[PDB]
Amino acid sequence: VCPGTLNGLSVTGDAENQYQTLYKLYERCEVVMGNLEIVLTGHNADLSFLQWIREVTGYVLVAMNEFSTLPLPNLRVVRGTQVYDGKFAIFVMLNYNTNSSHALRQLRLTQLTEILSGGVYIEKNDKLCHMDTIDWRDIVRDRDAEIVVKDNGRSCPPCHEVCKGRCWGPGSEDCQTLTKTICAPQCNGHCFGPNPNQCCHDECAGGCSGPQDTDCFACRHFNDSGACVPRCPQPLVYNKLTFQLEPNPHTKYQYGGVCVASCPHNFVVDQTSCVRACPPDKMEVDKNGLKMCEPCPKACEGTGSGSRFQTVDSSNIDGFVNCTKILGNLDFLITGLNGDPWHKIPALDPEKLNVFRTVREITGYLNIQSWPPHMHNFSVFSNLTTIGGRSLYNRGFSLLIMKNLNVTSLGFRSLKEISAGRIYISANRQLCYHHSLNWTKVLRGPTEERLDIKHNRPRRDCVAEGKVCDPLCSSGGCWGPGPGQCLSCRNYSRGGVCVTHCNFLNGEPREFAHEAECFSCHPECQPMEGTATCNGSGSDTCAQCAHFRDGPHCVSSCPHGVLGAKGPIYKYPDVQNECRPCHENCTQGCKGPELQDCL
C-alpha cells in the first residue's frame, strides 16, 4: 500500500532522478492510493518493482517512454476515482522513439479484470502489438465509456493458437481470461465459471474464487472484516409487515471503505458514518468523546485537494475575513505570495496575512512553504489552538514548515493539540527556538516515528548565540524567545505571560491564586501586608473591607436611591463603617435608624 501521484505529463529532474523517484515510491507497493503515472521513462529502466501492484485507485497513465514491456502482471482492478481527460481510466500515448530504435511493444496486464469507472485510450504507438485483439468490453464496467485503441502496431504477429484470438502477447502464457462476456444470462457481472451457479457476488471489484461475499478479490464499497457489503450494519432493523424499527445490537461506522467499531477521535460522526466535515445543512456539535453533525455557521473552507484553490493567494485570502475555524487544509505555496501571471493573479500584499489572526482551529493540515522576507515568525497564527489532521498532505503529514529562510521562531503560542499525522520542519537556516520544544505535549499519541525536524539552524549555534527561551519557562520549552511563548510557566502566569510570583502578600495591584495564574483582587478590597489580600475577585472574597461593609459585601459608600421589591432603598453608615437600612418614614436617606434621623 502506497500513495499515488498527480503530475499529468510533467516530470522532475533528469532521466535518472525521474526513474529513482518512480522506483522509490512504488518499490514494494500493492495498492496505489492515487494515479500511476509513468511518463518519459528511458529504454533501459528496470521496471520489475511494479510487479506487486494489484489495485490502482485513480488512472494509469503511460506516455512518451521507450521501454519494451510494462511489467504489471498482477494488476486486476483499476477503480478510476480520478479520470484522465475526464474520460479515460487507462491512457497509453506516443510510447516510441522518433528514430524507431526503442518503443513499447507489450502491456503485460494478463490478470486485468475490471475497470470500475472510465474508458480506455491507447493511441499513436507505432510498435505496440495485440491491442485490437483484446475484448476490452469484458474489462470496462460502464457501457457508456469511450474506448479508442486504434493506431497501435503495423506488422504485429497473431495471438498464440491456445488463446482463441484474445491475448496480451505472442506467447501461450499471454492469453486473456474472459470473466463477464461468457457468463450465464442471470449474473449481471463477473463469474468464476460458465454455469448459473458459478457467479461472483454483486459487491466484488474484479473476479472471485467462489459465490460468497468472503470469496471476493476486492470490494466495491465496504469491507466488513472479510465480507464485502454495500453499507456497514445499520442501527435499526425494519419489519416489512408491522412498519417498526428495532435497535441493531451489532452496529459499525463507515470510515474510508472499512467498517469500524467506533469513529476516530478527530472525525465528526454523521448517520452511521465518519466524515471530514458536515453536510451544508448541518453543523459540528461536541458530545461525549466524539463530535456529531446536527441541523448554519459560515462555511469557511480551506485549500488543497477537494477545494477550489491550491494556495492562499491575492484572489483567495479575502475569503477568511472573520473566520475562526477553517474546514480542510490551509496551504501557502511560493506562487501564492509572488503571483501567478498564467491566470492573471497579482502578488499578495504581505500584510493581508493578518486576516488569519482570528483562526483557532484548522480541521486539515497547515502547509507553509513560503512566507514574506521581513516576517521572522508565524505570529499571524498565534491564536491557533488545534490542528485536526482529518485530511493530510500526501500521506501522514499534518504540519509542514519547509525552507523558510528568514524565519527564526515557530510562533503558534496558543497551540495545544495536533490531533493526527506527522510533523515536517526542515531546511529553515534561521529557525532556532524549536530545539528545546517537547512535541509529546502538542502532538497526540506515540511520537517516535512522527517527528521529522532535520537541518534548520544548528542547535550548537542556537544556544551559543543566546537564543534559549526566557528562564521563567518550565521543562518542555517555548515557541520563541519571550516569556509569553512558553508551553507552561515554572510558577505562575499573568494574562498568559510567565511571572516569578503573584502579588499575594505585597504589591500595589494585589492578586490571588487561581489555576496557576495571577488574578487581581476586588476594587473595594483592603490591601494586606504580610498575609493574603483576598481569596477571589468578588465583593465578599477579601480579607478586610477597604471602605464600608454592607452585609457580606464591601462597598465605597452606603447605597442610596436603589429600587428593590418594596421600592426605593436607602442605608446609613455606622461608627464601625457598616451600612444599615434607614427608618421606614425617610425620604432620600438618613443619619440613623430613628424617625428623627431622616433627611
Partner: protein
Amino acid sequence: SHLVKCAEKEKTFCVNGGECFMVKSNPSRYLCKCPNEFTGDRCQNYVMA
C-alpha cells in the same frame, strides 16, 4: 522526440524555473521539466526528503 519548446506567452504556464514543453495532436497539452527540488504538474510544490 515528441516535445517542443513553448512560445513566449506559453512559457508563463510553468513556475519556479521549470522549462515548458508542448506535445506535438489537436488539443494543446502542456509539460514542464522541474528542477530536482520542485514537483507538481507546474513545478509549484517543493520535493520532501
